[PDB]
Amino acid sequence: SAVSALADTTISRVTAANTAASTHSLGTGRVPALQAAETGASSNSSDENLIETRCVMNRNGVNEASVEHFYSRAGLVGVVEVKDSGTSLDGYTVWPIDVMGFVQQRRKLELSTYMRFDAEFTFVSNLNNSTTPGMLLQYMYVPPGAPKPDSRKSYQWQTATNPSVFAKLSDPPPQVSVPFMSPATAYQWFYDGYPTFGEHKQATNLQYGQCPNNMMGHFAIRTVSESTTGKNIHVRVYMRIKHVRAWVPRPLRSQAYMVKNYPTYSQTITNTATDRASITTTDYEGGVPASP
Amino acid sequence: GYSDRVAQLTVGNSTITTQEAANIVLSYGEWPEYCPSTDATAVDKPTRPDVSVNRFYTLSTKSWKTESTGWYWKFPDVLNDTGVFGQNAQFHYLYRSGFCMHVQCNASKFHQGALLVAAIPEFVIAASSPSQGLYPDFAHTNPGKDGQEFRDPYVLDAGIPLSQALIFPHQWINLRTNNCATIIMPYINALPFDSALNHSNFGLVVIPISPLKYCNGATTEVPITLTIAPLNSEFSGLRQAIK
Amino acid sequence: GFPTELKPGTNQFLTTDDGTSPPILPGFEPTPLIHIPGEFTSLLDLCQVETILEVNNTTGTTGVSRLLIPVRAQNNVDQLCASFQVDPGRNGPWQSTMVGQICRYYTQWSGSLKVTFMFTGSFMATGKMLIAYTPPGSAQPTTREAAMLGTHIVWDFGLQSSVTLVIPWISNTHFRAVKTGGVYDYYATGIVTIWYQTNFVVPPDTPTEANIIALGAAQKNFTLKLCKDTDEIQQTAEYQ
């Protein structure tokens, strides 16, 4: 029955490539080492053809390098501060959902040009002093076009159709599953284009690269209150990408990010490789040579 | 098991010959194809102006200099005002196509230098900030038929390292080895069709990695010519022509 | 009321826990999946793509010139052209590589590496280079006679402008920590030194200096272990 399915659920190890035993090759016309990098093809030279190799039955597992295992890890995608003290006596915050505000998730995602994934959003909410009193919060997903709340009391919080999570700060972090929500067949971290037609002659070309296919709306968070609580709440949002398809691998960003929704670097271009003294300098003392 | 150095690319009424080729790159192993009914979303019949749009358009020649930093184009943009392609790309809202990009740079056996010719899908151009200066202008994002000189080829004008641009479909033009670079690129997008004016599906970078060095008496004007051919151009959404 | 007993680990949010979670949208059917060229499923497939080594990562050199290994006609014999270590997670030339940047998302690595050197001189420029990989234990070889005792290739410039130096997996452990330095030089892969086997010989009216472009990649037996956070880009404030 289904016991066969449950048995084949553990991750079976897939091993790296074995090395075959090789011998010396003295001849002409067989040049496994001469390549042509101009072809855009990487070298197909094997260690069995450059050196005399032994037979290694390689049992190293290559599973952890999957796109799933690389990406199915919850990282901080949003820090929301529900301000209800001082000058900002709001008790609610409407947060634009963007997973590009923090370096670790953003850099990992931009390894890919297109990604199609579901997500497991977790909300870690606490006070300034790390404490978690019983405080009912509402976590309303406001999809693009839905009325956004303008107060802690406004009618939008009735969440008749919007998905809302109600949880106290004392409860374990609210965690939900988000599907692949996009008019496109994949999210697009790099959109070489403009969302609208026009001349695009504005002094601030703010719309370059802004694909509305990634704009998935706003997370509207409030404390379920009747007046100012006097407490600021820090909600931290962690996305765990799952069921992930990645397309068009890209270079991992080498320059420090500056803004959220734009590739933009400082004129002080940092070298992708740390500098050394000369092209003949290495940082390795090694052992004492037996006969220099 | 060899790659022949001579090659002839023939599409439409255009034929490109090379005698120093370097094994044409088929981007991501996938030839350009028309949109399968399974992946199509628009319901209008697409136009397929096969021979009038799928053909080699020679579009720009850039003089390679010793201090040259490189140039980039955007594939639909570089053809949006050229031939029956540009007219189909203006009259139609939806467009999809692959391309065969043939970059031509020949020099003597006494010149040296290597060019990195790469086809970058979704080549979002960055602005270098020391606000209005935070985003690149339309001339840098869509340079057109002329292309744009690289400001910082090291970071590809995108913040990403040039040394990893070989993750994209690329060839080299090493002057001692080859005088051309051919990249066949299918249609890459999260959408089956898209606007040829709003969206640039691929960037077309030609960056000198090893600089052009010659001696006194050698031809100083070593040009780089970009010839691109749409492949399987479909156009839907016929309306008034928009530039 | 089925009798249960909560064990330690209840209410914890382990960020790497692959568990179920309640769907926010019942009945949601996503946009149909269409074919997009270029799907990658493994980061090992990306580590096998040859990317340029920044071997000229020297103080003063800027830009694309950091990618070039200068090679010129020598007045002496058996001189060192360039050297670099082959620890893919070490600060240095491998930082500019896809393999060296995907390694830094992992704690331990294993497998043969590969540097593809492309000569970018004139067709009339001839030469022969000895590119030696020195296994651990020895510092950078001081002479070519000492370097040729290790895994090396003699590279003849010609119509095939590129050569591959397969850095073989020569390790005591099955895996090597990506972290190097200190006691973690227990995992130092070694040094690669480029030597002039013969001279860089050019005819008259031909440039006497040229450039080797190194291309670092991984072999088919390359492996990565223990996903970790990379040390590449830092952040002090949220980006908008």
């Epitope: 050394r276 300098t281 | - | 003063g60």
Partner: antibody, heavy 111, light 104 residues
């Protein structure tokens, strides 16, 4: 070879500014930083600052930030240093140094 | 700012002796040291780059060695023209602190 030709000697009245030149030759100018070193006669060498001939990025010492301005003419392959607020402690020999893999120095400029 | 500390501030030896200058550093400069020989009147001539690479034209009598914090320049078979001032110079980071100097 890699020759850095600095400007001629300078004799400027106090409270002024002089534009010292450094016409690089023999290498790609936009590929190496240009550094300036100050040496009062008898005293040692003092590093003024750097300039990248690709973005104008200049990093001076804490004792020369408001006393030296570095520019570059990428078309002319020439670097410049215009010492502002000239004094007596600013009368010295000035060199332009490129390092890369080999420290190349100019000839100097008496100021 | 990684500052320098050149140990021998002055030295006077005869032709044939072997003088060894020392150039410490505040922090590890990673072989980013250059020794110069400047005789008053001429321009600073580079002797050893990267703390070990003998510059072009410099006689094999000169030798640079060291790693990390401590570095040493040795002049074996001290010929006649080996007089003047000897400056070490770190080129690791922002300050680019030169050496104090060594009269010889």
């Amino acid at each position: 070879q890699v020759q850095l030709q600095q400007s001629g000697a300078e004799l400027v009245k106090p409270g002024a500014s002089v534009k010292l030149s450094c016409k690089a030759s023999g290498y790609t100018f936009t590929s190496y930083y240009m550094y300036w070193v100050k040496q009062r006669p008898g005293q040692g060498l003092e590093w003024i600052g750097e300039i990248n001939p690709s973005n104008g990025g200049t990093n001076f010492n804490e004792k020369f930030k408001s006393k030296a301005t570095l520019t570059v003419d990428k078309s002319s392959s020439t670097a410049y240093m215009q010492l502002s607020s000239l004094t007596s402690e600013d009368s010295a020999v000035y060199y332009c140094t490129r390092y890369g893999n080999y420290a190349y120095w100019g000839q100097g400029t008496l100021v | 700012d990684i500052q320098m500390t050149q140990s021998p501030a002055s030295l006077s030896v005869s032709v044939g002796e072997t003088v060894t200058i020392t150039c410490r550093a505040s922090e590890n400069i990673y072989s980013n040291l250059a020794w110069y020989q400047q005789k008053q009147g001429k321009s600073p001539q580079l002797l050893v780059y990267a703390a070990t690479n003998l510059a072009d034209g410099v006689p094999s009598r000169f030798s640079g060695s060291g790693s990390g914090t401590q570095y040493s320049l040795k002049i074996n078979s001290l010929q006649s023209e080996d007089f003047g001032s000897y400056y070490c110079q770190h080129f690791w980071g922002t300050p680019w602190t030169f050496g104090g100097g060594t009269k010889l």
